[PDB]
């Protein structure tokens, strides 16, 4: 009742010391579709669920390509995702050109956070309404990072974002102790089983609504779509 005056801008503090527009922007992440990202001792895997407007339209793509060793997944708005992807690509390109070395994922995500913090303090701007999942590989091994509209980033070992991702998070927490020993197979399967918990109990996963991205010790970032996903889907069970 008393909140109507203090929730119209990001430059106004509420009498309880809260910025309501940041909390409102954090709710745009739950407007997308579920995404799951996990890692092992050698590889890093991203799994995403695609939606389509109608039966006569192609499914929207969720997994993008940033560099030979970095890839991202999107859940939220689209324009913000495109802008952030352009920024990531430019930074990686500049670092490689200048130093003849790949840009570390930690430095890249720190740059992302520093850039995203600004529009939450000045007038005439709005926060970025997008959440990302970043998978990379460098001298320290595989990495999985999560980004938030509030300019906050975390270093995870397995994370899920999107709509109705609580089930995926619960499954990942339950099966966390077996991830570090699995090879690429059964790791993609753990990811797919985690993603399958976000669906109604009647329907299953086909080859036209899943995307997979893998980066490893000596394997560059690759995206598998449509018929390329069948080998990973052959061995799944009947949704126990």
């Amino acid at each position: 009742m008393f909140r109507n005056q203090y929730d119209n801008d990001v430059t106004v503090w509420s009498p309880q010391g809260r910025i309501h527009q940041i909390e409102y922007a954090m709710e745009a992440v739950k407007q997308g579709s579920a995404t799951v990202g996990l890692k092992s001792k050698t590889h890093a895997v991203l799994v995403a669920l695609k939606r389509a407007q109608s039966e006569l339209a192609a499914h929207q793509k969720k997994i993008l390509h940033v560099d030979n060793h970095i890839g991202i997944s999107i859940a939220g708005l689209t324009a913000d995702a495109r802008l952030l992807c352009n920024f990531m690509r430019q930074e990686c390109l500049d670092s490689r050109f200048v130093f003849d070395r790949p840009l570390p994922v930690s430095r890249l995500v720190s740059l992302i956070g520093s850039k995203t913090q600004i529009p939450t303090q000045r007038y005439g701007r709005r926060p970025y309404g997008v959440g990302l999942l970043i998978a990379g590989y460098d001298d320290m091994g595989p990495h999985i990072f999560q980004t938030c509209p509030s300019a906050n980033y975390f270093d995870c070992r397995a994370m899920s974002i999107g709509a109705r991702s609580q089930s995926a998070r619960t499954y990942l927490e339950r099966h966390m102790s077996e991830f570090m020993e699995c090879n690429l197979n059964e790791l993609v399967k753990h990811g797919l089983r985690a993603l399958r918990e976000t669906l109604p109990a009647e329907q299953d996963l086909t080859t036209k609504n899943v995307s997979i991205g893998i980066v490893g010790k000596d394997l560059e970032f690759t995206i598998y779509d449509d018929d390329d996903v069948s080998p990973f889907l052959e061995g799944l069970e009947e949704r126990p």
Binding site: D94, F97, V98, Q117, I118, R122, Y123
Partner: protein
């Protein structure tokens, strides 16, 4: 960094790595850029066409241009010739072709010879004295009949019924002046052009209503 963003004027002082009167500021941005196009400011062997002779004249049935490649096909309906610096001719005539295509797309009607020649002269006039060297004859056919113009890097732009530039310019020009005639058939025009280019010391083009063709 929100206070510095409000001031819409990025000074080197507000950036990182600044100390003293200078600092680690000019050594920060060393990337390859994103997207633009612009010639560099002023501070080896440059290929130039020296032993080349060209010839062009217009008559009732169109424009005939011959040379000894050395002729640029700008459009299906426009023709050009190079003399001097090859790179400059190629670059600026590519720009002219792009401009003509833009005009046709916008206005749904092909550009005229006079407009194209004026555009080329305007583009090449901005860099007078910088070092550019080019000489071009532009041929075409539009709603006002055949056209023929001469454009160079000195700002000259003239129109006439007979032109010739090259090492053997004098002899060929004299021959085709002696043998010229406005009411001339295509075969006699071909013979006159061949004889003139032979006495100058073989390509041959012919512009018509609906685009140019190659004779030999």
């Amino acid at each position: 960094m929100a206070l510095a963003s409000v001031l819409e004027r990025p000074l080197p002082v507000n950036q990182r790595g600044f100390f003293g009167l200078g600092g680690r500021a000019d050594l920060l941005d060393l990337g390859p850029g994103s997207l633009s196009d612009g010639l560099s400011l002023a501070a080896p062997g440059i290929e130039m066409l020296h032993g080349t002779t060209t010839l062009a004249f217009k008559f009732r049935h169109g424009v005939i241009v011959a040379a000894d490649k050395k002729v640029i096909e700008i459009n299906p309906y426009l023709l050009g010739t190079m003399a001097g610096g090859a790179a400059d001719c190629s670059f600026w005539e590519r720009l002219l072709a792009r401009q003509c295509r833009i005009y046709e797309l916008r206005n749904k009607e092909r550009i005229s010879v006079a407009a194209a020649s004026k555009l080329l002269a305007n583009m090449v006039y901005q860099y007078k004295g910088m070092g550019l060297s080019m000489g071009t004859m532009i041929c075409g056919w539009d709603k006002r009949g055949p056209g023929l113009y001469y454009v160079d890097s000195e700002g000259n732009r003239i129109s006439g019924a007979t032109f010739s530039v090259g090492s053997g310019s004098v002899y060929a020009y004299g021959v085709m002046d002696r043998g010229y005639s406005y009411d001339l058939e295509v075969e006699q025009a071909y013979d006159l052009a061949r004889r003139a280019i032979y006495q100058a010391t073989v390509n041959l083009y012919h512009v018509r209503e609906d685009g140019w063709i190659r004779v030999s």
